[PDB]
Assembly symmetry: C5
Homo-oligomer: 307 residues x 5
């Protein structure tokens, strides 16, 4: 049972695809195991870069293929290097850029909690053939969060585990318990942009929306809210074109709903005010004074959504 030691160097996590539940990771893979000792030129380890590795493999170098389980497509492989030691041990080193998949919940956008994950697993060798001895992951992390879209939180979770496959080939004495490396890197979304350029102005609109009740005439009151209705639509599109595409509503998506909700409510109140009547235009001088009702009523219903 070959003991293989692994090291992950995380260079960059970027390009989250919200609809695909996808992100990109640039970094290096380092794999190490000990084979039977051999002749090295001089006596210091021999280095084999890129092209020449396939010719070592053709003549019988055992370089087990380690597959990135949750990678979408096949990773862009940078330089590869084999360092063969005289005492026997062999180290595989290669840089990669890959597209990885993991469950990504984006509902409380833009205040996301996600975790970028790497899962590594031997393509052909089970726990009886190849096992992962240990793994440290290096997030060459620090500084400049305010410049970056994502703020990394942990220093990285690691687990070596055994995954068993029930539905196989026509093999089964115990050949079904492959050993797996799992890397987890926690992150929080940078909410500042969506706050000031989306949350705040949207807020001013909805608030300013309510000032429609400070109009004197019923006529002014009613046709005016049609322009404000027209405003939320323009705002929605502005948001729409910019926000990440998702199959569900975000918090922002919801503020927009409420905004529409504000105005349709206002239309009804304005109308109700007018034609509930004792003459012709007895605008009930109590509901003309839904001036403070609806604005503070919007705060209460806004606060029911928290639990």
């Amino acid at each position: 049972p070959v003991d293989v030691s692994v090291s992950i160097f995380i260079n960059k996590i970027y390009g989250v695809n919200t609809l695909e539940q996808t992100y990109k990771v640039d970094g290096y893979i380092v794999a190490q195991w000990t084979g039977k000792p051999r002749k090295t030129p001089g006596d210091k380890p021999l280095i084999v870069e890129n092209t020449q590795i396939e010719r070592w493999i053709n003549n019988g170098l055992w370089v087990p293929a380690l597959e990135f389980i949750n990678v979408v497509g096949s990773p862009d492989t940078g330089n590869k290097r084999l360092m063969l030691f005289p005492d026997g041990r062999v180290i595989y080193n290669a840089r990669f850029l890959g597209s990885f998949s993991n469950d990504m919940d984006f509902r409380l956008f833009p205040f996301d909690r996600q975790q970028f994950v790497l899962e590594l697993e031997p393509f052909s060798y089970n726990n009886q053939q190849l096992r992962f001895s240990d793994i440290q992951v290096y997030t060459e992390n620090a500084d400049n969060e305010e410049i970056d879209e994502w703020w990394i939180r942990g220093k990285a979770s690691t687990h070596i585990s055994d995954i068993r496959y029930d539905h196989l080939s026509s093999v089964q004495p115990n050949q079904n318990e492959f050993s797996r490396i799992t890397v987890r890197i926690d992150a929080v979304r940078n909410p500042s942009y969506y706050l000031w350029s989306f949350i705040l102005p949207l807020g001013l609109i909805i608030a300013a929306s309510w000032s429609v009740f400070w109009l004197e005439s019923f006529s002014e009151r009613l046709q005016t809210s049609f322009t404000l209705m027209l405003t939320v639509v323009a705002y929605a599109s502005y948001t729409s074109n910019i926000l990440p595409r998702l199959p569900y509503t975000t918090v922002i998506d919801q503020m927009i709903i409420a905004g529409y909700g504000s105005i349709f409510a206002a239309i009804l109140l304005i109308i109700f005010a007018h034609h509930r009547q004792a003459n012709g235009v007895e605008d009930d001088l109590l509901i003309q004074r839904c001036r403070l009702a609806f604005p503070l009523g919007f705060l209460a219903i806004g606060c029911v959504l928290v639990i």
Copy 2:
């Protein structure tokens, strides 16, 4: 006639291309057939990964090309593996990411249901040389629908059949009946985003549009309905930028049409109400307040359109 057992593992279905009628599937293919016995090191099964597989083929190993019939372009191939047994049998294993083709009807968007299909067929060996003995497809699925764009519902449909080609080649008899595997996976669109962020608000717009008839003046009535016209267009663009490109109208596209009409309907009546006359101000002293007619009249036309 070589019997081949096939197994597809579906890892990810994503990337719907609404216009090209295409979807991308990440997964593994496993194909098994029995060849001539020959003797592997020790006598335990011996593994041939990626690069070395082709080197076996040069020395004459029969590794048949099984083509993805409905794949668009040629798929991203991950690691390949041959597991060669001494008793003869050979197992082909490979990971793929492929863009697949299938007829896709999007008229009832965002309530379309689709089925993602794989078609596999040996490229060159007909049913009398190579035939598909069986195929199982395992969709590693569960839970999290509320998070995903698509909801897979069946656990997968299977079809092994014979495809007959009437013309080619200059072979006569029946080297024309290649054996084909067809995998089918049903899905429903998560309509939640489009419900709350498109259906509901458009509904409120059309609804508040009807609020034009509570206006007292004719000028108010007529001018305000222009704002209503401008709003549906603004919403129309808002919609367009997000909705998928199609060559036919969707349900949402139709609500848009409904909106334009309602307002255009109102314009005509408001004009009609005020201008055929004995008067100047000839508001038929009670179409005035077709306040419940037309709103109710629009809903009736709505339930006929569901026919």
Copy 3:
């Protein structure tokens, strides 16, 4: 002069790029010719896959390169195979996905019909070395046009002809007439989306535009028409965001022009009615009632554009 019979299978025609004048074609190529008789295993036809094809050619198998003349870039090739029969016979079969170019006039959008074209020609061998004996094209077409973007019409036109090149080496008897296969497939665009979601609402905009003359006050007359101007613009953008970009105007583009045209013309009259005068206030109360006058003048100008 080697006689080569070719057969094309068209699987999918899609992804027209309007600016580039290009479209994508997925299908299979088949080429057959007779060489010198050879010895196949047994006496059965020998089949050769992908990789192994070149190794046949490295020791001298003649496989002439047939170039897709009007292809943009070089095609994505799927599985390839050589079928070698003992009597001399050779069949080349390969799947391809290619981006092809042809002159595409898009002025009468969305009522354009285009023709998808394939041109195939030997890369190195002229009239006298390689000859196209014949070619059939199988358009595996049928049904459901209502779902697809393009409506394939013919059963595809075919023409084998001789193309002469004037600029050679200065080689002397008739070294210059490569033989060319030309496949033509006619198509018409599905206008259904654009009719109901673009033309129709645009018409309603233009129509409701004319209702400005049913306003009684001049302020309303002039002020309102600015709101209608704004509407045509909002409609223009919505349209632009969706429509294919071209270097010329489409029918829809022209309709947008008319909308701008309709309103600016109205503006002048509304002003003209008011201020060309015999007092200050005699609105020509008939040019006011140009109410249905240039609506049919607009219909006349629309119907004159066909001759």
Copy 4:
């Protein structure tokens, strides 16, 4: 010093990227030079296609690398051909599609003149090793200009030159004078589309914007110009989402500015009319009659624009 005769065949120039200052060129390369005599089968020229070309090179055949100096990335190479003649001649022929880079000034869009340029230079061999004897360029196109976005006007510019590099590796006497082929093709943008669908309605926007002065009341003056401001804003995106991205302003970009200026200018004129007074109400009937001033006052600032 080897004489190399070159021929460029331009098939297609398309896909200009305004931001990268990039354009795509499809065509064939033809290179011919005289080597030491060879003895070919029979003795009429021997043809070597694609893959087998590398096998001749391994075998000591001199096929010099000619680099496309100004290509961005490395070209999609189609089929390659070696024609080896018995008298010594060697002709290299290949199809290519590449994105090329060149300086492109886009300030006066859409009335741009651009020139699509090709530069070819041997990658490794200087003028004293490899020299360009002559050069022909063949542009496979004519007619149908009003269908294409760029109108090729000239034929093809050509110049063989010697480029000297002062900063090399440090090789001393004269190994720094590589010979360079420069192909230039002049073209005009098809401005028709932008004239009819952008410039023209923009004019109608601006002109009708000025009609705000034929309004009677002061409130009418001011309020409407806000609708007019909103309209021009409205025009900008409609414009923005469609026009190519640049880092500097175009003709059109300025036209928009002018519209903004015009409206802002109007507001001021309009407020001023009302409030500089001999009473309060003295609308100076020359500044309210800037009905013709301000319109032709823009045309003056307008034709000084052109000079």
Copy 5:
């Protein structure tokens, strides 16, 4: 410790990706070191391009892989060339196009200043085996600045250093010491475009916003500011679709925020102005004549947050 001299030729720096913090670099790498002398044909240096380089490496030529440390993914390499001199020295020459990574702060866009960085480091050999003697960088450009997006300042700053990794594998003495070349090019964004076409009109918008106070009735004042709110919103989408996507606000974003604030501020004043009381509505004589207070008050806060 082999001393290697490097030369970077920058041809073009383009296509910055703001979200990815990425830029594209087209150019050449030249690496030279001195080997043990050889025997070349005749005695003049022998040239080995592209394909035949791997065949020289197979026979034992030491061509060390120098990795672009901060390259995202793996670069498009053009032609490769080995120049082998008889005195021993070996020159690696090859063209590249790559996407590179570096921290890019875009907060003061469009007045950001950035710095393009290249990092090179041998992939397998530490300072004691391969050492960087020097590096020359050729920035082949100057002038033509108002047309270019970025204004280059330096002619490239460079610094060669020794990087040691704390977390290695099996090495004990001090062999953890790879030598790194760091290339820096300082740059300016040309802000003129965003000045005239985004800053200016946004400014005219905010300015005319203040003209709301030159309205006479309260209904016009309050009702008009609703249209102006809509204008800024309309401006926002305009802007955002065009401005580069970032995870933070730019200056321009903040100008937008200010517009909303200005208008929302105007709303409160106009209403506050109105229910002000000693009666029902006594218009406070000068607080509505903050017609010029608020604008220069906006100019004052405009100048304070700059500090």
